Amino acid sequence: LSAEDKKFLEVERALKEAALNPLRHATEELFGDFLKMENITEICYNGNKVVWVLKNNGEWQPFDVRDRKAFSLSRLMHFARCCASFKKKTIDNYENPILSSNLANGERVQIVLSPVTVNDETISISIRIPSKTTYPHSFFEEQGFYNLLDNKEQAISAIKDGIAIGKNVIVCGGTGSGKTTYIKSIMEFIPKEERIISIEDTEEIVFKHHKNYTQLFFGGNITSADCLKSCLRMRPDRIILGELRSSEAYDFYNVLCSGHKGTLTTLHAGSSEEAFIRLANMSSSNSAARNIKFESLIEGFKDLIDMIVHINHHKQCDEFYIK
Amino acid sequence: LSAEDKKFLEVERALKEAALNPLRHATEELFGDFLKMENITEICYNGNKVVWVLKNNGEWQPFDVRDRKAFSLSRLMHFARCCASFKKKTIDNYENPILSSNLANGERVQIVLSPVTVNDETISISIRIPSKTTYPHSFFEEQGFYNLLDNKEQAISAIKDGIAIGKNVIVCGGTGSGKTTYIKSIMEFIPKEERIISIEDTEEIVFKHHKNYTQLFFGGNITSADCLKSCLRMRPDRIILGELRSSEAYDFYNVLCSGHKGTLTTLHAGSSEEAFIRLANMSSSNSAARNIKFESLIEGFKDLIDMIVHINHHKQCDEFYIK
Amino acid sequence: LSAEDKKFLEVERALKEAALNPLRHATEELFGDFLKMENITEICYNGNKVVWVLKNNGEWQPFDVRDRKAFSLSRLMHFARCCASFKKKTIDNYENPILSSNLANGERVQIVLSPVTVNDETISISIRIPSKTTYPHSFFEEQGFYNLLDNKEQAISAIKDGIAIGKNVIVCGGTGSGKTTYIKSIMEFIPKEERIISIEDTEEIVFKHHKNYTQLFFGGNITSADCLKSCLRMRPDRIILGELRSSEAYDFYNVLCSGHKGTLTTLHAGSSEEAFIRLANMSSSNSAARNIKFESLIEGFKDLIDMIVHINHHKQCDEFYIK
Amino acid sequence: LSAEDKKFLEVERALKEAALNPLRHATEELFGDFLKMENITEICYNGNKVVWVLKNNGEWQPFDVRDRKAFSLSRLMHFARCCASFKKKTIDNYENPILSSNLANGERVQIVLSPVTVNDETISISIRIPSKTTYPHSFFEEQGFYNLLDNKEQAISAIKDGIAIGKNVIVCGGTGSGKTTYIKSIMEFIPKEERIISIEDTEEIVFKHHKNYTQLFFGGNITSADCLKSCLRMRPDRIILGELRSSEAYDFYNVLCSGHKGTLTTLHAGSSEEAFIRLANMSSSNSAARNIKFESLIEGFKDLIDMIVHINHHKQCDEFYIK
Amino acid sequence: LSAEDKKFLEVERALKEAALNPLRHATEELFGDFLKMENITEICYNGNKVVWVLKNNGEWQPFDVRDRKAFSLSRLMHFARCCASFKKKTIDNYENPILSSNLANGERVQIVLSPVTVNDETISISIRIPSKTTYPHSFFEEQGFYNLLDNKEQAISAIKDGIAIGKNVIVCGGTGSGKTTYIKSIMEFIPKEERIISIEDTEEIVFKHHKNYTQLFFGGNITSADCLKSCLRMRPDRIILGELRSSEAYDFYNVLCSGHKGTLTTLHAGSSEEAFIRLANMSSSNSAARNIKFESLIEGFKDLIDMIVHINHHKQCDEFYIK
Amino acid sequence: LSAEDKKFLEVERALKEAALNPLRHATEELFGDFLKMENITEICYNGNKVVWVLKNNGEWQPFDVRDRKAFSLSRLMHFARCCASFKKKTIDNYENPILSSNLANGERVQIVLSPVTVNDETISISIRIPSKTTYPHSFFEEQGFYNLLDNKEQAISAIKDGIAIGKNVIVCGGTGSGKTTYIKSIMEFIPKEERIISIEDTEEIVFKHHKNYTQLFFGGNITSADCLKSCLRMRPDRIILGELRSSEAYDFYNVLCSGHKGTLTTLHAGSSEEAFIRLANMSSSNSAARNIKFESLIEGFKDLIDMIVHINHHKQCDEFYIK
Numbered sequence A, B, C, D, E, F: 001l002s003a004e005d006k007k008f009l010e011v012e013r014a015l016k017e018a019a020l021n022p023l024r025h026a027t028e029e030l031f032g033d034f035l036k037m038e039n040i041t042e043i044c045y046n047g048n049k050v051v052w053v054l055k056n057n058g059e060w061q062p063f064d065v066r067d068r069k070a071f072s073l074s075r076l077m078h079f080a081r082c083c084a085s086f087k088k089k090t091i092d093n094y095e096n097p098i099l100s101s102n103l104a105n106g107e108r109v110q111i112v113l114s115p116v117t118v119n120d121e122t123i124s125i126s127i128r129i130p131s132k133t134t135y136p137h138s139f140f141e142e143q144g145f146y147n148l149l150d151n152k153e154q155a156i157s158a159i160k161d162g163i164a165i166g167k168n169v170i171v172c173g174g175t176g177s178g179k180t181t182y183i184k185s186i187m188e189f190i191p192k193e194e195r196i197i198s199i200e201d202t203e204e205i206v207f208k209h210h211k212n213y214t215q216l217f218f219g220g221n222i223t224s225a226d227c228l229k230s231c232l233r234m235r236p237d238r239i240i241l242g243e244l245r246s247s248e249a250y251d252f253y254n255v256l257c258s259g260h261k262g263t264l265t266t267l268h269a270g271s272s273e274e275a276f277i278r279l280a281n282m283s284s285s286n287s288a289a290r291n292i293k294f295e296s297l298i299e300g301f302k303d304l305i306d307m308i309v310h311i312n313h314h315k316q317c318d319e320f321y322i323k
């Protein structure tokens, strides 16, 4: 059975392998040492023989690689080229100098080539390391995630009871504030019996507590709207989005209007009142909202969203919006 | 007479049979056992050797199928492929990894393939089982469908007297709350002499009480709007719209504005006040309302809709909106 | 003279005849008996060996035709096919399962084929019989058309004097409420010397009282707007429209703004205040009104329309709106 | 000099003559007798062997032509065909059954053919006869054109002193109320030294009083807007627009906003307050006003238009609006 | 050096000469005598053997040319044809009967041919003569340009100090009111050291007082927006526009919003409050203002424009708007 | 390592060199002497044998070049041609007489050719010289940059403490007021450990104080928006946008709404209150804000922008807006 599955998948595996293998190899060649480093949130290269690692504690560390033969334009470009092709894209010094793509295991990768870089010797690479660990919610309490709030104990209960009861909750903050990580922690409180459907650009969320679920991924020609539209034909009890980014904020808006079972998602915002604004803006970009009152969007989102958690850049909750 | 009808239809039957036969066979191969199971509302597969059946009572049951050969990728993919082709569509691992289609008897099927699913061994299938039984309205009363309401006895009369009079009534709730089932029950009260025209994505409504009627179906190239447009040229006394989903919401709006008698439909909403908002949003997506005041849509729908029943996830009426 | 007219028209007559003859024949084959029946307003078939005739008194009568060889899919399809071709259209079981067309004498016909019908044995046909008789206005009084109104005598004078003086009047109601029939009755009061131009989808209005007039018809590529635009270059004293349906409601709106000689038309509405709304909606669908205040349309229509007559489903006036 | 002008124009004259000659002949054949008739405003044919002449006094006279051979379909259709071709258009019983065109001397012609007319023996023709005479303003006073008004003497001075000063004046009424005729009369008051530019669909205005002027004409590909655009580059002192019909209404608006002196035009409206509304509607149809407040258009036109004369259907001024 | 410049330009000169030479010749043939006449502002021909010259004093003088062989359709058409081709255009009696173009030295020329003219013997030509002289501002004072104003002395100082200080000033009036001429006069007050960039359709402005400047011209495919956009990359201290006509009014609007060094321009308006309206209208026609409040444009223009000068048709300032 | 980098880049270098070498040579030929000149901000040529250098102190110096051969049309045009080609564009006397391009070292060049310039001997060239020096903020204080303000000492602290905290600050003024120069000075206050990403049309900003950073450049096909989009995927701590010009204004808006830390940019505006208006206008031009309240944009920008410095044309701060 695991036999005939291999034969059936042979042509696909071989095709996928033709890209993976060289990329895997290039990724190890350059960034092996760095990707091994523990408690890091980004690996950046700035086309000047120095690799900058952002640690979880917020400190940037540089490492000298002027000796490395792997930080040669040829070797670097090969890696770019490998990167690009893996996700069915191109990257050149003409009409495609900017690449968003991924490493073998899914980590996001931003590459920038001349003439967008200062010169033709300058290649920019940015890798976003996800949290490797799934921290339990009790750990968030113990390291004082909630300690900035007046309503600290009342909040801890809000999230636990809220989630268990199927409230619409939004975790917001800036890039690297640990929104994803926190989402993963609170899934503890969703009953084990509920059916969960996640929607992501990369695998990140884990299912330590639930047995019945399905992960959706958007990419290339498949948008997050396509995933969300699919998701609603898959009899979900919980929808976990992961990121509101663009267009889809209107679909998500219309899901709330039909009073769905318990939605959970993340967004880039600076506060509760900002969240409602980022949502209304993102939603208006969807042409299907062409005739909708922008104040009606904000008032709409205010009516439906039960709880907002905001995270400052020192990974602490500085706003716990309820109702 | 039933003779020359067969000869006339011979080419069509043969063409339809070329897809039905294999699909019928594949469906029995995989899901026969589960489709046999009584009092279920969804059959899900999560590409992990486990079949998850949602029961009427709201509990999810998993079944082990790691020994069943039918649950091999090749066999699964054949089924997927059979499914797609039956409704004149394609499903692949490139530009068509999401499918909405149907089984031989009309049950809705959602299939998702790699690279939307987490890996290339992971195939998602979701089948919505309709209610197999047509419950009499007296059964609804007895099992206390109305028992949450203050205005319980006053509502039971509102629905019976209102329907029989030709009021515009809307049943709303979440996926699986028993909207369709409830609609079918209250058709009892529409006089037996009234001509009914139904509009559906699949057969579901039944005509136990009426002799003069016609069922319409929207499919690939034919929209619900086309059906509603046709419907208003078939001298209907009652129009029954299984579901308001998208654009057609404006057409339905303009049917009400023309006075029409005895409209009856369902919708995904959380509450009465939500229903009017979901209606106004859905309507605005119709560009024929490009210049229409969104507050004028909501006030319009409020003027025209006579009754709204909302159903919570425990299959009970928690709001009976009147006038 | 009637000689050379025949020769000149020979090629056209022959071409038109190629469709008429077979359709005439098919129509007699199937519906001859029914079309003969007196005091009927619709003939429906529901693809189940039963022909349903709606009578003027509002009762649906069924007739068994399971014996008829003319209610065979082949014979039925031929008739559909004849129907379609007569009005330069197609009707199939793929991309054209819905047909709006007409019988030889103009009666509207709605045909619906699988896969919009429940199965491939099910063919839906709906024929709208016009009133065969031109009732005099005194007959409307005698059968108490106006008897529901408080202002009964004051209304009878409003319509008679109104019309004679060239007021803009609108008759509204639901399909089959006798709007057309009533229009035809009140033409009695338009002075015999006035030039009338009618605009219709089918011949229905008759000129018992006027000698100087011209009938326009919209169909296929020619819209009602084209007819109305033409109509205003034909030095009319009265414009009789017959139905406001879609786009044209704006042209009709602009005709009133130039204070025309006396307009008369019908619309599907449930009341006076509804009429103004159906008008404003229909008008906004015309792109030429893209920048027009929707409240300015309704207030515009209120300024111009002198009299609205609404007819309930028991063919009685339940609202006589003046000024 | 008149010699070499003929040789130069020889090819054009010959080409123009190929259409004129047959049309001239056909027109004389059918309508000679009626065109000879004095004090008529429309000649209509209703495809029923009767020619209906509207007289200046508002009475319709029918004439029997069932013996006239000229009123055979072949001969009628030849005339239609001649008509169409003269203005570089086609008229058929398929995609071009409506024609707007002109006779040799410019009179407007509307022709309608089957299947717009009731049957294939029915051809509609409508010819608008312009006033043949240029009545002096003193004749208008004597026959009591102003006699309905309270401010009768104060108006006669308003028109004479206002025109001579360069006010923006608008004559409005219904088709046939004598707007054109009245315009021509008041040109007496525009100083003889002023340069006048007229803009018309046909020749109608005459220059009894002015020596320095130029007439513009809009035709198939050339719009009234193009004429107005050109006009403002011909150093006009007075612009006379026979009619505001459609888009150009915005251009006329922007001429006023540039201050311009001595504008004079006509329009279809029922009253002064209607005139401002017909103007604002017509203007909004020009997409160059896509972002303009519709109440700002009406307030704009009210700020700029100095005088409005309205003419009822008994050729009398029933409103002389000032300031 | 002036040697190799000739050789380099030889091919261009020859090509330009092929059009100039014949046009120069035709222009002399027809209008030589008239173009010599001093103190004229327009030369018009009306296709009736009479040449009408508008003098500066506002009087139209006719001259008889029925004897001239140069006023022959052939000769006239040749001149039209020469005119057209000079500016890479065509002019015919079909799809190009209207021509805007220029004489050798730049004077604007409007030609109109049949069928826009009354007949095929009628050719319209309008030539706009610019002021040949650059009057000093002291001359404007002496002939009492400012004498109509209450704030006469206070105005003379406003313009002198205003301009010197770099205020945004607008000269408005009707065609031929001497807006350009007045602009040229007040350039006296712009410091000799400031860098000036002009933008025109034809050369008209002169630089008697400044040594550092550049003239831009719009024409054919190059718009005034392209010129203005260029102009802002040329390190101007003063921008002199000359005419606001259409689209560009929004660019000009955005130049003011960045608080530029001192803008000076002309517009066709009847007053200060009209100027703000013509500006807001013209600006809205620019699609880039699609979402901008029209009251926000007018209030925007009011905030930025420091001084408006309006000129009546007797070449006097009747409004000196400040602040 | 620097070895194989040369071999890898050999083809690109050679291709880039084919344009650089001639341009480098031409630039030295014409403008070498002037480019050498110290304390200049623009070098202009006005196609009249005179080179006009704008000095830092605001005085324009002319230089005679009528003897220099380099200032012949052929030589000038070669330079123009060299210029165009370097940035993959064309410049001609037909469809491309305006060029925006750059010299070898990045200085902006505007060239204008006939027929935009007054004649075919007239070539316009404008070169914007960046500040060559990176002045320390203490120099700004000493030369009294802040001395016009009431809140002088309170502002010096506002900029130093605000920057170091991550406030969103905007420097605005007119072309040449020293916005760029001032930005570079205050970068001193951004902590040395912060990762900076710059976005520019040319290199100008320098990194005297920071080790971890990456410069982005927008060019023909690559927009500033693309750079900003990329930037937000490179884990920036500070984003420095040399200039807000057009569409990207909305993207910048949505960066602020996501909370982001330490944004820093420049803009052309006259004052703080102008800045918010230029921002809201620029933003609205982005169609992604099609449905956004323009007063909501201005109120949005006011909520997010923490500090605004305005610089008058005498290189001094005349407005230090806070909160």
Ligand SMILES: O=C(O)c1ccc(Oc2ccccn2)cc1
Residues within 6 Å of the ligand: B033, B034, B036, B037, B063, B064, B065
């Ligand atoms: O006859 C039926 O309806 C039926 C359905 C399902 C079924 O599934 C299971 C059960 C346990 C483990 C695995 N599969 C067995 C039998």
Ligand SMILES: O=C(O)c1ccc(Oc2ccccn2)cc1
Residues within 6 Å of the ligand: D033, D034, D036, D037, D063, D064, D065
């Ligand atoms: O000479 C004319 O002007 C003339 C016009 C019309 C006319 O038409 C008639 C009259 C009656 C019956 C039939 N045709 C006869 C003569």
Ligand SMILES: O=C(O)c1ccc(Oc2ccccn2)cc1
Residues within 6 Å of the ligand: F033, F034, F036, F037, F063, F064, F065
């Ligand atoms: O060495 C330099 O920097 C230099 C620059 C410019 C220059 O230009 C002049 C001066 C006067 C007349 C003409 N050209 C001469 C020398």
